[PDB]
Symmetry: C3
Subunit: 487 residues, 3 copies
């Protein structure tokens, strides 16, 4: 006739950390952080990305001779570009608002080349110009998308061109103006002086004047070229007029499948896989709600935290050794709480039903809640800046770092707090069960000193299950117990 | 014959949430989130706002003929403007640094129109130009503040004008340049080519050259007009000089009564009402410290939280001895002192514990309100179509800060709810075992959170017991004699 | 033959705060905030700063005659500059991208002046020009680092100049263009009209045109000057070419020592002392991990929080058995174990719970001071008069982040205080109930929180029950006999 209280223990070895103690041991724990990747660039949802190779965005758009494989591109999901591309602008020059164009391009998925000004339409000029900088097989050449207008014979008639956008979507147009290096070159190229280039649309008004100066040679050239761009609207019209130094476009780019994408800076190549999201260092395939690989990602993946370990305790403090004051019992595999019984006719290792289910519900509800709360984390997006906007770059970097630090601190503190609370709740529950049993057993027994007491009158297995069900009736057979303790 | 401990209960049915479980019932609860608005736009401390109606800011400033009701404007409190006003620039063109002007205007309450350059002072030019773009009653017209200088006869003498700012406050001046669409138009208008417009002050020095090209027709016009602005200082002067294509001003705006204001983006209309803080969706009249209507407000108004429920539990768990449930028969205090003597009974309560309980919860609520008084407040801003990066940066800033503060508020509320519940349980248990310890062994524990007094006594006995002055040597001998049986 | 449980008490009168009540007296408390300073500016790590005085950055770089002390400058640590310097541009004008230049200069520790275009090389023009705006001792003068080119006789031949950067590091070059105020002045100064100034490098291409207009008189002059700057790279070349209105440079600045520094907008003068961190109000020499002096600091120094009190408790709640209050005579540990046998008494304390309490306190202190080590730092910046939106956005940045971090710190310390007090109470109660549990029933609880013993034990009994080695079946027959 003996019953005692304890808890289930096993041979686990995982460890967790709390606000007051470190590397403490627990019965069951669940990880929350993913830190492995396959280290490859692979397809996203079956749509292979666009591999720029050695070229650059400007080289691809203008049609550099080297980038001959990019004359027609299918749909893509993200753009892969190197850090310092080689084949950029073959003829030296610049590009106004490069970074704005890149930011706009970041959210475009497909393109469509449209011929807006056929080359042969210029019947009063020369259109076969080319330089040695952009040369193939020794012979000079030029970009594949623009036309160089030079005087034919000995005169340069005024050049006029216009287009009405009836394609069906917004169009992107690029044009350029050439700056010579000395007056003799200007005279022998355009047979005029003091020329101008004027571009007009419904909302854009521009008029540029070529500049002549002496500059250091780049790629064996003393000249320069300056390019500009604009977004042509629906049913609008753009007008071209110049007296020289004009680089007219020959193709227009029409946005067709505007979606969500990004630009990724890496040096890798393209493999054959299929992931759910991509990272510059590789691809991630996991279900945990956290990762610490790289702050910039494309697709869908868990949040990024700048930590290294995040372990959530969901069990008892494993303290292996017939009572709860010495430790748990290895023989308990059914429930989480000890209700060991030992009658005269036999013993048993029963558990308590009420406590186990409430504990299970509490822990699963709390796990769901802690997962759910952090769903509003901050996310980062790549951006570009020129060399005259250092303040903006500093501001952007500070934003990213500050928000990442704040969220990291929040998550770590929450996890440590939760571990501590879980341990305290479990131990509180164990004393709660014990003293509930003690008051239920109105005297009639003495504590041996092993966290449990021995009954002073002989009950039976019916009495055991009656006490277990919280249905013990003290005045029912109290007289025999009184007689026994009278001894 | 015995006394028992319990706690007061009632029939309230409000629900709160905590970290461990959700949707639990407490006797008394408080609310912190306000989520109702009257859906109207009205005054602000008796100062009606400025209702631009169907005009944009540029149209009002330049003096578009449509916005003829805004020629003179009294003091205002905030400015209401539609998303895409119809009457903006009648003559097609552009405005330089529009967004900076709007941001500067966001913190000015009153204006004052001052005539600086009288129209009749130009005695060597023609000042009756106009166009069909800004036409009233069929006849061509122009803006009501600028002057279009054209050639008189067949010559265009150089134009000179100046003004010295002695008004007594900073001034705002606007001028403009005109770009024709062909050489013949320029020759017909100004008789000369290769002209220029020069503007010079003590700090700003500028010079523009008119540009000629062919453009698509907008509003039936091929030309364009470019406008620029500057701020004059006290006791400063500004000099105008040009040979053509000059759009001279006639009125300067003097800044008086600088204060705090804003720009409001809505399609509503002013009504007859009074409020204390205003939102794009309506007014707010409440004393709670939180709301979730709209992030942009004007005037003093509670903090904004992107959530939907915020309830602070200040009571006990509701259930129907203290181990079986509470008692509805107790309303004076909080904790149970069910007394039942031989000659009577009672439902007294511990007045002492109630005092520390109520002051604790009150200062807790006050502190919780206090900690979040330093919230982050958003401010409206405007960006052109060439600063998408800046606009994205600003939007990300706002969303990040709002999310951070929302998370903080929710976590704090849950923490406090759990702490309060555990605290109340702790005081109940502490009172129980303290009473048991004071009573020592001169009784028998009935096992129902109540022990039956074993020593016989009148009201003085347990009166001293609740007073904490129970004397063991008073009734140890008789109790021992009785329990010896 | 009696024992009782208690806790050590002292006479300390330091009050702490918590989320439940205010101004609670404790036994031992720490501090984490520093709020004092010497109110002086002096050397950082033994390297004196650069003291501009009354000259702005432009005045120093161009070589204003007033700032003659700054012709040669040694290494520095940070730059001291008044908010509205007087001796700026002696000749009225402007500067292109002034703020970008200041931001770039914020991270440079030493310069090096190199003569790239000697003055006498211009043999076809006149280089003795000067104005009354920058006048020393009555006679007209000019900037010390620029050359003004005028007509030579009655002709202005085309001016050309070039320089190849072989110095060995990145160089900074400054040039300028002159805007007259009337046509007669332009003719009498340069003999030509419709001139231009052209500057060309491997990356920068520019061509400006002088502008003529009427302007108000500033400093007695109606003209204006416009300056620009660029960064010359390794083995690059810069070409100058103009036909008038050119302000050619004479010295090039070479970036020698690159490091970390900043610009401080102060008003005082350099003093003679040493420090490790510097703030616009004074120097800080402490070891606590927080301060509330000024958001902008230079060097290494604790973090900035916008609070007024951060007190951490690390001891029992001070209050004069354990139910009556503390023990003034307990000076050994933290949990009393009062021993009193028939032959004598004792004041032994528990040496077990003390060590775990101490190590837990140390662990929590380290954790709290370590969690915030990844805080946010503020860096000074400057914005022009047409970038109000940028300045507003920067201010909102700084204020928001500071508020977030100070709120987090206060919340953490309050929770820590609550947990510590509750933990100590739990420890003492647990010790008492554990002692009672081992005692079994051979004593009667007097009511002072401790029980008078039943059967006459001795010092061996006393130390055995102290060690948790009591054996109830060993010696209880005497208790049973005397129970009657
Ligand atoms: C229409 C055209 O392409 N013309 C020239 C072109 C231009 O004259 C100029 O180079 C543009 O910047 O240059 C090309 O020949 C260049 C050649 O010109 C000599 O005069 C000079 O001495 C050489 O050093 C070299 O620059 C070219 O390949 O760039 C093509 C064509 O002759
Ligand atoms: C001084 C003035 O305002 N004159 C004209 C003005 C200008 O001549 C010019 O059009 C503004 O850019 O324009 C207006 O008249 C011109 C009108 O002439 C028709 O023949 C033509 O078909 C129209 O497109 C238009 O150019 C005008 O209506 O804009 C008014 C004024 O007489
Ligand atoms: C560009 O093409 C569109 C499409 O034809 C032109 O819009 C038409 O204009 C005529 C006016 O002569 C109207 O009768 C049609 O109804 C318009 N079409 C539509 C679909 O609205 C537009 O005018 C052209 N652009 C220019 C500058 O002429
Ligand atoms: C603009 O008006 C102001 C005020 O009339 C002029 O300032 C005065 O200038 C004279 C010239 O010596 C001084 O004697 C006065 O003391 C000035 N007034 C004050 C109040 O100080 C100013 O000169 C005028 N601007 C111009 C360009 O003449
Ligand atoms: C500036 O000076 C450098 C240093 O001499 C020049 O670089 C040399 O150029 C010649 C070409 O004739 C090469 O043979 C040398 O090997 C280069 N030197 C080094 C160290 O690489 C440079 O060319 C000069 N700048 C210009 C525009 O000529
Ligand atoms: C080469 C030169 O410096 N010339 C003269 C200049 C110019 O003529 C203009 O004034 C400059 O804008 O002006 C002064 O007369 C003057 O008033 O200080 C000084 C000098 O005699
Ligand atoms: C722990 O016990 C389980 C029980 O099945 C067993 O499989 C496992 O090997 C044990 N681990 C060790 C390290 O013995
Ligand atoms: C104890 O915890 C620390 C973390 O502070 C850890 O580095 C160490 O490995 C742990 N001890 C053991 C035996 O794992
Ligand atoms: C991702 O991992 C799961 C197992 O964790 C596997 O079943 C699945 O095939 C993986 N996905 C890919 C694309 O390899
Ligand atoms: C209370 O909240 C719980 C949360 O799971 C929900 O299941 C339950 O339906 C809610 N009760 C009511 C009455 O809405
Ligand atoms: C706001 O509501 C209270 C509630 O009674 C009312 O007394 C008060 O008049 C209201 N405010 C205004 C401006 O009407
Ligand atoms: C301690 O703090 C409380 C805050 O409620 C304040 O009322 C009291 O005056 C403070 N003590 C002293 C000595 O100022
Ligand atoms: C900083 O304070 C400590 C405190 O004693 C002192 O020893 C040290 O000399 C101080 N440092 C300086 C530079 O004065």
């Amino acid at each position: 006739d003996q019953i005692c209280i304890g808890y289930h223990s096993n041979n686990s070895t995982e460890k967790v950390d709390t606000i007051l103690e470190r590397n403490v041991t627990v019965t069951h724990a669940q990880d929350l952080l993913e830190k492995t990747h396959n280290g490859k660039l692979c397809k996203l949802n079956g749509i292979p990305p666009l591999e720029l190779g050695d070229c650059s965005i400007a080289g691809w758009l203008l049609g550099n001779p080297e980038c001959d494989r990019l004359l027609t591109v299918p749909e893509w999901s993200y753009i892969m570009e190197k850090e310092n591309p080689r084949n950029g602008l073959c003829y030296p020059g610049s590009f106004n608002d490069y970074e704005e164009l890149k930011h706009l391009l970041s959210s475009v998925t497909h393109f469509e080349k449209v011929k807006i000004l056929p080359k042969d339409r210029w019947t009063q000029h020369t259109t076969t110009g080319g330089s040695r900088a952009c040369a193939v097989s020794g012979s000079p050449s030029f970009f594949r998308n623009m036309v160089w207008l030079t005087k034919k014979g000995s005169n340069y008639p005024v050049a006029k061109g216009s287009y009405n956008n009836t394609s069906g979507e917004q169009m992107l147009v690029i044009w350029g103006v050439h700056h010579p290096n000395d007056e003799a070159e200007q005279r022998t190229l355009y047979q005029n002086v003091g020329t101008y280039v004027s571009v007009g649309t419904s909302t854009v008004n521009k008029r540029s004047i070529p500049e002549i100066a002496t500059r250091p040679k780049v790629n064996g050239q003393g000249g320069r070229m300056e390019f500009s761009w604009t977004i042509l609207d629906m049913l609008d019209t753009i007008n071209f007029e110049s007296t020289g130094n004009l680089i007219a476009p020959e193709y227009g780019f029409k946005i067709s499948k505007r979606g969500s994408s990004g630009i990724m800076k890496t040096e890798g190549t393209l493999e054959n896989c299929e992931t759910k999201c991509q990272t510059p260092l590789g691809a991630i395939n996991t279900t945990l709600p956290f990762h610490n690989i790289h702050p910039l990602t494309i697709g869908e993946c868990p949040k990024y935290v700048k930590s290294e370990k995040l372990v959530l305790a969901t069990g008892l403090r494993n303290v292996p050794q017939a009572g709860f004051i010495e430790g748990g019992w290895q023989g308990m595999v059914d429930g989480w709480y000890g209700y060991h019984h030992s009658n005269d006719q036999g013993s048993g290792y029963a558990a308590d039903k009420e406590s186990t289910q409430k504990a299970i519900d509490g822990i699963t509800n709390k796990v769901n809640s802690v997962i759910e709360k952090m769903n509003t984390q901050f996310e980062a997006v790549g951006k570009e800046f020129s060399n005259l906007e250092k303040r903006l770059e500093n501001l952007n970097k500070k934003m990213e770092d500050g928000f990442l630090d704040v969220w990291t601190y929040n998550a770590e503190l929450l996890v440590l707090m939760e571990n501590e609370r879980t341990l305290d709740f479990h131990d509180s529950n164990v004393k709660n069960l014990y003293d509930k049993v003690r008051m239920q057993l109105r005297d009639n027994a003495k504590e041996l000193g092993n966290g449990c007491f021995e009954f002073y009158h002989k009950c039976d297995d019916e009495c055991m299950n009656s006490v277990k069900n919280g249905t013990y009736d003290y005045p029912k057979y109290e007289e025999e117990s009184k007689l026994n303790r009278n001894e």
